[PDB]
């Protein structure tokens, strides 16, 4: 991972991309929103594990550290994917190709329109910056590695794990800058755009926190992936 060139980092990320999934409803039948969005999220999570395992550096970490990082990041990862899919659909959220929803559709669940609104604004910001696919994959990998890295332990192994994570992040920063130099931006423009992109990450965190509050308020054993389910899926033979 740490020996990859910028172009090889980019190719590895683009190749790791998960598929776009569909919602499971009978489209011949009349048009619950939360059950549909929960089922979609459950299925995406499996693919997210596969993706995370292909982000360079990720499998170099301990299984316990892989679990912690996904546990911290999984709703942010789903959200950044949604915002990206929704970028060329002003005023709508493309949860799936057969489930494109507007903000009024979110009113059907108390607390949800607020979240819908924040996600639509972030998609709006992406459109204003003209975010590129290569930039988006870098940013999603940055969420995975960064979100849980401040909440681990100071065993010697933990100290080595945090160092590695920060080295892999440094390589993604290099790759982002490379992408922007290749596009022909000036050095000033490169650093300004790097900052703009990373500051949107703060908002994506905020959104995930607000959503997790909603999910925990359902008080449901079939909602939010447990440590153990994540551990079971990541602990592959
Ligand atoms: C209140 C928010 C958390 C609503 N979010 C907004 C982002 C999102 C959802 C579903 C599929 C998605 N695809 N891309 C993004 C995305 C939706 C949601 C709904 C239920 C769960 C529950 C999951 C479980 O209980 O295990 C998770 C996420």
């Amino acid at each position: 991972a740490l020996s990859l060139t910028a172009d090889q980092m980019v190719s590895a990320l683009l190749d790791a991309e998960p598929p776009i999934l569909y919602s499971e409803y009978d489209p011949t039948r009349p048009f619950s929103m939360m059950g549909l969005l929960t089922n979609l999220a459950d299925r995406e999570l499996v693919h997210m594990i596969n993706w995370a395992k292909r982000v360079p550096g990720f499998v170099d970490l301990t299984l316990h550290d892989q679990v912690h990082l996904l546990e911290s990041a999984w709703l942010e990862i789903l959200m950044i994917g949604l915002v990206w899919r929704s970028m060329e659909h002003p005023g709508k959220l493309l949860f799936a190709p057969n489930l494109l929803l507007d903000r009024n559709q979110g009113k059907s669940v108390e607390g949800m329109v607020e979240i819908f609104d924040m996600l639509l604004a972030t998609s709006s910001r992406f459109r204003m910056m003209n975010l590129q696919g290569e930039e988006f994959v870098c940013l999603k990998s940055i969420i995975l590695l960064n979100s849980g890295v401040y909440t681990f332990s100071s065993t010697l192994k933990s100290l080595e794990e945090k160092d590695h994570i920060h080295r892999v992040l440094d390589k993604i920063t290099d790759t982002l800058i490379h992408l922007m130099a290749k596009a022909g931006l000036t050095l000033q423009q490169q650093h300004q755009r790097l900052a703009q992109l990373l500051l949107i990450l703060s908002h994506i965190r905020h959104m995930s926190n607000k959503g997790m509050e909603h999910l925990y308020s359902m008080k449901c054993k079939n909602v939010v992936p447990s440590y153990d389910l994540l551990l079971e899926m990541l602990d592959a033979h």
Side-chain angles (χ1 to χ4, degrees), residues 1-28 30-91 93-109 111-156 158-170 172-218 220 222-237:
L2 295 187
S3 49
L4 271 35
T5 80
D7 294 350
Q8 293 165 351
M9 179 59 80
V10 172
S11 313
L13 301 184
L14 291 168
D15 281 26
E17 276 288 276
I20 294 173
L21 315 175
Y22 280 77
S23 183
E24 272 190 91
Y25 64 91
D26 185 349
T28 68
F31 182 71
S32 95
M33 187 173 292
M34 190 60 38
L36 290 177
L37 296 174
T38 301
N39 178 256
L40 175 65
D42 287 349
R43 287 186 284 115
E44 286 188 275
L45 188 71
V46 192
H47 289 277
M48 185 193 299
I49 297 320
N50 289 351
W51 163 81
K53 294 275 176 190
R54 300 180 57 172
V55 172
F58 187 83
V59 296
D60 293 332
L61 302 178
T62 69
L63 161 68
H64 157 282
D65 283 353
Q66 292 175 47
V67 176
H68 175 78
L69 295 175
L70 276 158
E71 190 171 46
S72 313
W74 68 271
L75 187 56
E76 289 175 88
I77 291 161
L78 292 185
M79 288 179 165
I80 196 172
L82 177 61
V83 174
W84 169 252
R85 292 197 294 282
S86 303
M87 190 183 45
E88 297 176 321
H89 305 98
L93 291 171
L94 201 149
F95 288 95
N98 68 335
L99 191 68
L100 189 72
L101 310 174
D102 66 19
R103 99 185 276 272
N104 290 334
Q105 293 164 295
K107 291 178 159 155
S108 78
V109 176
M112 187 64 84
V113 78
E114 286 89 357
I115 293 170
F116 272 32
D117 280 350
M118 291 189 282
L119 292 163
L120 290 161
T122 315
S123 212
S124 164
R125 178 67 184 150
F126 277 21
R127 209 191 303 114
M128 168 84 59
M129 293 186 67
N130 199 27
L131 184 67
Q132 303 293 295
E134 295 84 351
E135 289 178 319
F136 160 72
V137 299
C138 290
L139 287 175
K140 189 168 44 161
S141 287
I142 287 170
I143 288 166
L144 177 63
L145 293 171
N146 185 60
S147 296
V149 79
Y150 314 101
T151 46
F152 285 140
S153 184
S154 60
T155 60
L156 179 53
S158 291
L159 290 170
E160 299 169 320
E161 300 268 284
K162 280 178 278 215
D163 185 66
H164 190 237
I165 294 167
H166 283 113
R167 292 194 200 265
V168 177
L169 286 161
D170 288 346
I172 313 170
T173 299
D174 293 349
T175 303
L176 271 167
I177 290 294
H178 190 247
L179 288 169
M180 296 172 195
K182 227 141 76 156
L185 282 56
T186 65
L187 275 163
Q188 197 183 19
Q189 285 169 334
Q190 289 165 35
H191 70 59
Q192 296 180 356
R193 189 181 180 79
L194 180 61
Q196 297 147 12
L197 290 179
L198 298 183
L199 286 177
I200 295 161
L201 302 186
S202 277
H203 187 60
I204 292 169
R205 186 75 83 127
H206 179 69
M207 289 191 302
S208 167
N209 294 319
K210 295 302 290 198
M212 285 311 277
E213 289 170 32
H214 196 109
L215 299 189
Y216 284 122
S217 86
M218 294 165 64
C220 173
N222 300 354
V223 167
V224 188
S226 69
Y227 196 86
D228 289 1
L229 172 71
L230 293 174
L231 177 59
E232 171 78 27
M233 305 180 84
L234 277 160
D235 188 12
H237 59 251

